[PDB]
Amino acid sequence: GLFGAIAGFIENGWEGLIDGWYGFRHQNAQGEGTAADYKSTQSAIDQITGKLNRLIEKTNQQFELIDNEFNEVEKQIGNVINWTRDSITEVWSYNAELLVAMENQHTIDLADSEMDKLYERVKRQLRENAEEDGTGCFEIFHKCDDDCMASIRNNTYDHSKYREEAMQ
Amino acid sequence: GLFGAIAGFIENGWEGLIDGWYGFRHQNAQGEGTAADYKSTQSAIDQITGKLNRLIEKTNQQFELIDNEFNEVEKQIGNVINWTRDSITEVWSYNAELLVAMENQHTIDLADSEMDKLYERVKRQLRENAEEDGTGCFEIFHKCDDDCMASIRNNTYDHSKYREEAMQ
Amino acid sequence: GLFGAIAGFIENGWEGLIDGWYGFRHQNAQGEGTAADYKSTQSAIDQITGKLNRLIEKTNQQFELIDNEFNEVEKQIGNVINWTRDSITEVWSYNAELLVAMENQHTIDLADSEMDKLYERVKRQLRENAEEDGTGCFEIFHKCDDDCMASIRNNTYDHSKYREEAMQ
Amino acid sequence: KICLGHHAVSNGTKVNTLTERGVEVVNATETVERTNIPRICSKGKRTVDLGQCGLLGTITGPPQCDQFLEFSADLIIERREGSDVCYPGKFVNEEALRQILRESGGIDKEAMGFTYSGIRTNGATSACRRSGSSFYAEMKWLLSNTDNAAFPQMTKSYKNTRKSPALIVWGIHHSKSTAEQTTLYGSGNKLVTVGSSNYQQSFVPSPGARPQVNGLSSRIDFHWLMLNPNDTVTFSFNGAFIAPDRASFLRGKSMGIQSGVQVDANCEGDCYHSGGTIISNLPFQNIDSRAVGKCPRYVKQRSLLLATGMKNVPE
Amino acid sequence: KICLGHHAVSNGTKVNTLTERGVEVVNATETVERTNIPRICSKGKRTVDLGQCGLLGTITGPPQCDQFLEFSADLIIERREGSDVCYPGKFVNEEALRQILRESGGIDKEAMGFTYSGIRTNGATSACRRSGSSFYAEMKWLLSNTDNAAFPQMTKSYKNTRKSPALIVWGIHHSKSTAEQTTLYGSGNKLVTVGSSNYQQSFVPSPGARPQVNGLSSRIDFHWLMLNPNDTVTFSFNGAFIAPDRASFLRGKSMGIQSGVQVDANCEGDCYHSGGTIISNLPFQNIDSRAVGKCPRYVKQRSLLLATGMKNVPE
Amino acid sequence: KICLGHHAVSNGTKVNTLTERGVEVVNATETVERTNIPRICSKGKRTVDLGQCGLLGTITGPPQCDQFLEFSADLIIERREGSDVCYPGKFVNEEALRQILRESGGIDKEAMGFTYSGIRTNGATSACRRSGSSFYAEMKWLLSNTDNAAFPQMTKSYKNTRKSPALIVWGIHHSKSTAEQTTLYGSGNKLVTVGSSNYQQSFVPSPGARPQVNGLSSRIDFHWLMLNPNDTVTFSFNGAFIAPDRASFLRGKSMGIQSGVQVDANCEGDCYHSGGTIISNLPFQNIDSRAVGKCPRYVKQRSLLLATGMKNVPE
Ligand SMILES: *[C@@H]1O[C@H](CO)[C@@H](O[C@@H]2O[C@H](CO)[C@@H](O[C@@H]3O[C@H](CO)[C@@H](O)[C@H](O)[C@@H]3O)[C@H](O)[C@H]2NC(C)=O)[C@H](O)[C@H]1NC(C)=O
Ligand SMILES: *[C@@H]1O[C@H](CO)[C@@H](O[C@@H]2O[C@H](CO)[C@@H](O[C@@H]3O[C@H](CO)[C@@H](O)[C@H](O)[C@@H]3O)[C@H](O)[C@H]2NC(C)=O)[C@H](O)[C@H]1NC(C)=O
Ligand SMILES: *[C@@H]1O[C@H](CO)[C@@H](O[C@@H]2O[C@H](CO)[C@@H](O[C@@H]3O[C@H](CO)[C@@H](O)[C@H](O)[C@@H]3O)[C@H](O)[C@H]2NC(C)=O)[C@H](O)[C@H]1NC(C)=O
Ligand SMILES: *[C@@H]1O[C@H](CO)[C@@H](O)[C@H](O)[C@H]1NC(C)=O
Ligand SMILES: *[C@@H]1O[C@H](CO)[C@@H](O)[C@H](O)[C@H]1NC(C)=O
Ligand SMILES: *[C@@H]1O[C@H](CO)[C@@H](O)[C@H](O)[C@H]1NC(C)=O
Ligand SMILES: *[C@@H]1O[C@H](CO)[C@@H](O)[C@H](O)[C@H]1NC(C)=O
Ligand SMILES: *[C@@H]1O[C@H](CO)[C@@H](O)[C@H](O)[C@H]1NC(C)=O
Ligand SMILES: *[C@@H]1O[C@H](CO)[C@@H](O)[C@H](O)[C@H]1NC(C)=O
């Protein structure tokens, strides 16, 4: 993707992350844990679903028979019809190919984007109390227990509360 | 948008910002003020106008009558014509829908992008003299009077000049 | 571009950079040097080549003659054919124009994106040992000899090794 | 320490993008429909399966079409075994007439009121059998009263007093030889002129040997026109003329298909081809480029996978 | 402290994107034109409003077309009240001929130089009235000198000595009965052969009763061909032949429309339909799929709003 | 200190994007092909250059087509100097027949086995010269044995015993006058009926003066039908009939072009127009909207530059 997170500075995904698309994996004195972030996940899901809703839209235009499978129509008008139909097929095969390729690029890029929004969100929560290691992780320069981790995940982490220790 | 500023970590827009698309809202001992940034605004405006100039381009192809509203042409050739015309309509309705949807996604995303470019520009001006609060604001760790604010807005802010105080 | 690096906070390109698309230009006590980054360059090149491979794909649909250049076919069926062919031309001229415009926007934006991924990569390597000046440069707050520069370029720079001096 | 990440799976799905072919994503979905239902899904639709009745036969009425002389339908199905004729012959501008009848919603017949004197009106043949020799149920085979008698020049007119156009059909009979034609209608060149207000055309019969079809080397040419409201059609003829007995009026709207599969009133569909019904929410299909109804757009690709998840980067 | 932000409004405009339906943006603009001007905007264009003259009539010249026998135009307007004929009849391949004349830029007439002896040349009827009985201004109704006299087999040839193709029109007269045809042209079967270098066709008249139109149960079949430069057309006929008096040559280029609205030389347009003119800078229109000229592409949607501002996030 | 940057050049290439016209990028490439090869690139393809033989002539066999009576080809080239006829005349539904023959792969001829008694079968003319007066090689000009003798009503039938449809061609001869026609075939109206199983049509000759082409004011009308396997065609005629001697069967598949340029067996191509061959990997072409084969899509633009490098920002 365009945002160089997924398949970028974040090395690979987590096959154990079964409850969401994106998440946090923590380590402290109490051990390691992994939890999913709902908001980022649902944002990506909502956007892909909107794409799907566009694509499963019903064509409400009726077309009728203009040639005959049992009794072939006159040759010349039949050659005109076949050429017209083959030209339209050319156009719709091109459109389908282009549509899916373009939409897949954008889907991949949008998922990349939601990962970065989550990473920067956490970064901005942590302020001067952490440093990025370059792999999607924040080195925390203070004791961060399970409740401390939980407050980072649900946006109740007070950087001031730990500011004094962490800079130190 | 893809850049998670507008409708992202920046909470909402300013209905009092009537002189530009993006801007600065400051607070210091002299009070609060809001001013628009011209460069970012005109960049977004120039890009949307370029899109408009593409879309109001004249088709220079002439098409003539191939059927008859007063004296219907023969049925079979008329059914071929109607089918051809309805197929082309199918194609152009699809193209118009896709074009506008795609262009609207890109317009929204481009406006999101210009907001982030302005935010990071200011961030890079301020260096170690400020900290981001996560809402689009920079906490300034030095006395910043109205002239000091004006220098941030028009890119004449010297971070060194305040470096000593701000880190302190 | 959407990422405000190329033609953005990075002022212009290097006409002396003849061995890659993106690179590092260093200055230390030993002088100045410029080298290309291969990984970012090849990522951009691979993506543009993939676009080219899509566009030079062979249409495997055969179309045959439906009118006559030496002996004009009957007028009415000829007017239907000409109108159909002109309508298809309308559609393909529109598609070609839109395709190239869209692809050019994305190519420009993707190249902008690879520049930012490289800049942030270096930023994350350097940690607290450097500060960004806002022009694409990192002010290094420690003595960084030619081997030190080389380690930044090929990702072997140990920020800890210089951490003590640089903060100081 | 705290780390951000994204999900992955052991087996992803490869898709194509603008910059890369065969990129693996966590999940994807098909956009091109390939699954066909080998029936005409007709639940909820007044359906007429013509079977052995040819669509044009519903206007003239050979025996195989007696049950279809005034049909009403939303969906009309032609079958490969259908025949428009009993006495051999064929329609002029037959396909134009089929396309009119496929979208008519059915036909409503009404007597046109022609009466005759000085001729026979009961021409019959063993090729149109109804418990013996008969003819087209909607036509009258006009003859001289006796062999070689002169067929009088005659004029028959019909005014469409209704509010929608009348489908008028007549026939030109070409006997197996000039000698057979004189016994039926008297000697000399015979002429039938057809005129209305937006139509004018003449017909002269062409006797001659033709390959024997249904035992006959003669043929009937069936012609038609649509007669506008308040307009009049006038027939001037002196023999070899198959006269219309009733006119047809179109009931409303319908669609016609050509199929070789059974009807299923338990599936619902709106996109038909000769092999069945395409029921799909997908925008494209790779089944039949000649499908009709409300259909996904036919495309040449068998598969176009649309990414529904992020790029898959496994460990 | 210093804060970055973006603008918003109390009432934005909802638009559609790839990922979302009904996203509110600060401003948007319409791409589909729905506003029609109920006139034929013809400012700056040589315009011919045919009125009661039918376009094909300009070649043969019934009275309603006398003012249009050599018209010149960039824009040709057909009206619903137009009639091509006075003596009832109709053209063969009429629509092909209309499409040729709509783009001709007008016609320039020239005498073809046929002279006759041994016949009448002044056939007239009260259906083509010019202060009495008259005929088509560009044709000559050829008759026997006296009733039932034999119409001599005759040959008339015309060489196109000009540099563009000549439009040649002739007519076949079908009298109300075989008896009336013999008084006009003498008894027996009558034949007209038409040949050039890329055309060959024969015509035999078909007398008979037709519904009375303009008091007549007879009709004239008008036929035409385009005669190439240096090529010759030869007419061989023995009666029932409406001879051409002048040939037509196409002036240049034009466009033809069919309208029911007045001409306005004070608005300028290039896209016409029967209800008026579409004047728009928009790339799409939802007004008439059969509009002609230089037009926005017809689309089925009534509205497609294009975002011209950022997402609107109000407080 | 360490700095990041990107490359640039002194002279970039301007391209267009969605938001801007004339953006300079480091490198770009053309997507619209304008370069034409002024030859028919035919390397690897069985090619038939008809030259002076008209495509329809390969079925009837005027002298210029003697070398092409049973051709085999993947690519068929018609030339502007080609003529289908020797004795003047023209085909009915000629373009339908050309399109069938362009994709046939060539024709395989077989005698249909008609034998005659009581007539002449060796009609010849100095317009079809083969070291003297001759005729179409695949036809037989049937005549009365002696001047004005009656042409007997005759019936000839042919059954297609092969597995693909038979192309059957016959001709109707229109002499220069009614008097000349009686010397060839005897007096009276003459009639030819054509019937099979899906075809029925009658023809009566039309004698008359036509402009002299190849010295003759007479013409031959060539007609055709495709006869299905196991089906029979029956000809009933009494004169003015150009009988078929052999039927044609289509060999396989091919493509036909119309060109004015030489054949080059040293270039390979699949997209042809009258001016040569379009050999290109590009998806679009601005050369000829009527190109045929496997072609880039024709577009109205002469150039559409696709960016292949980043934006160029020089110093
Ligand atoms: C326009 O295109 C249609 C095809 O979409 C042509 O009709 C098709 O004609 C081919 C032969 O040219 C038929 O192929 C045959 O298929 C059956 C198997 O079902 C079998 O007999 C052979 O395999 C043979 O190849 C095909 O059935 C037929 N399909 C349809 C739907 O009509 C048609 O000829 C073209 N129009 C003109 C005027 O040529
Ligand atoms: C091809 O399509 C056109 C329509 O785009 C068909 O012509 C249209 O025919 C319908 C009837 O089938 C006409 O509808 C009538 O509208 C008027 C009101 O203006 C009124 O009499 C009724 O409401 C009736 O529904 C319609 O006027 C007419 N429009 C045009 C522009 O011709 C045409 O029949 C189709 N071609 C063939 C060969 O069927
Ligand atoms: C359908 O369109 C074709 C064009 O794509 C029309 O045929 C073209 O007819 C024009 C005249 O109307 C020809 O123009 C002539 O070009 C030659 C130079 O090569 C010269 O004689 C003059 O400059 C003249 O303008 C053109 O050659 C011809 N092209 C082809 C490929 O046929 C055609 O008339 C249209 N169909 C109908 C039914 O009108
Ligand atoms: C994968 O995608 C399809 C279509 O979006 C969906 O029906 C299916 O449930 C998805 N499966 C998972 C595991 O996401
Ligand atoms: C047909 O004629 C009757 C008069 O008997 C009239 O009332 C009716 O309106 C006419 N309809 C049309 C469509 O002309
Ligand atoms: C809104 O958009 C339209 C079209 O771009 C423009 O004409 C109009 O002036 C715009 N209004 C504002 C307030 O931007
Ligand atoms: C027509 O014939 C004349 C000879 O009188 C000749 O000069 C002229 O070039 C010819 N034009 C064409 C188009 O053949
Ligand atoms: C520029 O682009 C074309 C097409 O991609 C390529 O063939 C050519 O080698 C390129 N040149 C350079 C210097 O990149
Ligand atoms: C044609 O007839 C023969 C009988 O002689 C038969 O064996 C063959 O299968 C038939 N072919 C078709 C296509 O009907």
PDB file of C-alpha atoms and ligand atoms in Angstrom, chain C residues 67-69 72-79 82 85, chain E residues 103, chain F residues 289-290, ligand 3:
ATOM      1  CA  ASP C  67     -19.488  -2.169 -44.603  1.00  0.00           C
ATOM      2  CA  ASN C  68     -17.744  -1.614 -47.964  1.00  0.00           C
ATOM      3  CA  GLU C  69     -15.127   0.972 -48.967  1.00  0.00           C
ATOM      4  CA  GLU C  72     -21.051   1.530 -50.458  1.00  0.00           C
ATOM      5  CA  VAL C  73     -23.665  -0.610 -48.692  1.00  0.00           C
ATOM      6  CA  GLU C  74     -27.303   0.558 -48.728  1.00  0.00           C
ATOM      7  CA  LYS C  75     -27.699   4.012 -47.223  1.00  0.00           C
ATOM      8  CA  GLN C  76     -29.959   3.239 -44.258  1.00  0.00           C
ATOM      9  CA  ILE C  77     -28.014   0.231 -42.964  1.00  0.00           C
ATOM     10  CA  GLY C  78     -24.878   2.284 -43.633  1.00  0.00           C
ATOM     11  CA  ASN C  79     -26.188   5.146 -41.501  1.00  0.00           C
ATOM     12  CA  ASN C  82     -21.756   4.618 -38.969  1.00  0.00           C
ATOM     13  CA  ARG C  85     -19.257   2.828 -34.912  1.00  0.00           C
TER      14      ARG C  85
ATOM     15  CA  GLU E 103     -27.536  16.191 -44.370  1.00  0.00           C
TER      16      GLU E 103
ATOM     17  CA  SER F 289     -11.734   3.558 -37.262  1.00  0.00           C
ATOM     18  CA  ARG F 290     -12.649   0.827 -39.784  1.00  0.00           C
TER      19      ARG F 290
HETATM   20  C1  LIG G   3     -20.039   6.140 -43.092  1.00  0.00           C
HETATM   21  O1  LIG G   3     -18.823   6.771 -42.928  1.00  0.00           O
HETATM   22  C2  LIG G   3     -17.881   6.664 -43.998  1.00  0.00           C
HETATM   23  C3  LIG G   3     -16.649   7.383 -43.491  1.00  0.00           C
HETATM   24  O2  LIG G   3     -16.067   6.705 -42.390  1.00  0.00           O
HETATM   25  C4  LIG G   3     -18.471   7.288 -45.274  1.00  0.00           C
HETATM   26  O3  LIG G   3     -17.656   6.846 -46.352  1.00  0.00           O
HETATM   27  C5  LIG G   3     -16.800   7.949 -46.653  1.00  0.00           C
HETATM   28  O4  LIG G   3     -17.563   8.805 -47.452  1.00  0.00           O
HETATM   29  C6  LIG G   3     -16.890  10.046 -47.691  1.00  0.00           C
HETATM   30  C7  LIG G   3     -17.878  10.935 -48.417  1.00  0.00           C
HETATM   31  O5  LIG G   3     -19.093  11.048 -47.685  1.00  0.00           O
HETATM   32  C8  LIG G   3     -15.599   9.798 -48.476  1.00  0.00           C
HETATM   33  O6  LIG G   3     -14.876  11.024 -48.474  1.00  0.00           O
HETATM   34  C9  LIG G   3     -14.100  11.183 -49.673  1.00  0.00           C
HETATM   35  O7  LIG G   3     -12.735  10.884 -49.429  1.00  0.00           O
HETATM   36  C10 LIG G   3     -11.932  10.749 -50.619  1.00  0.00           C
HETATM   37  C11 LIG G   3     -10.464  10.722 -50.212  1.00  0.00           C
HETATM   38  O8  LIG G   3     -10.106   9.385 -49.875  1.00  0.00           O
HETATM   39  C12 LIG G   3     -12.262  11.893 -51.595  1.00  0.00           C
HETATM   40  O9  LIG G   3     -13.098  11.405 -52.642  1.00  0.00           O
HETATM   41  C13 LIG G   3     -12.956  13.065 -50.862  1.00  0.00           C
HETATM   42  O10 LIG G   3     -12.037  13.695 -49.968  1.00  0.00           O
HETATM   43  C14 LIG G   3     -14.242  12.630 -50.141  1.00  0.00           C
HETATM   44  O11 LIG G   3     -14.396  13.499 -49.027  1.00  0.00           O
HETATM   45  C15 LIG G   3     -14.741   8.697 -47.849  1.00  0.00           C
HETATM   46  O12 LIG G   3     -13.738   8.262 -48.763  1.00  0.00           O
HETATM   47  C16 LIG G   3     -15.577   7.480 -47.443  1.00  0.00           C
HETATM   48  N1  LIG G   3     -14.766   6.547 -46.669  1.00  0.00           N
HETATM   49  C17 LIG G   3     -15.035   5.239 -46.516  1.00  0.00           C
HETATM   50  C18 LIG G   3     -14.055   4.459 -45.681  1.00  0.00           C
HETATM   51  O13 LIG G   3     -16.026   4.708 -47.016  1.00  0.00           O
HETATM   52  C19 LIG G   3     -19.838   6.693 -45.566  1.00  0.00           C
HETATM   53  O14 LIG G   3     -20.539   7.450 -46.553  1.00  0.00           O
HETATM   54  C20 LIG G   3     -20.742   6.669 -44.345  1.00  0.00           C
HETATM   55  N2  LIG G   3     -21.898   5.830 -44.625  1.00  0.00           N
HETATM   56  C21 LIG G   3     -23.014   6.272 -45.213  1.00  0.00           C
HETATM   57  C22 LIG G   3     -24.076   5.265 -45.441  1.00  0.00           C
HETATM   58  O15 LIG G   3     -23.153   7.447 -45.532  1.00  0.00           O
END
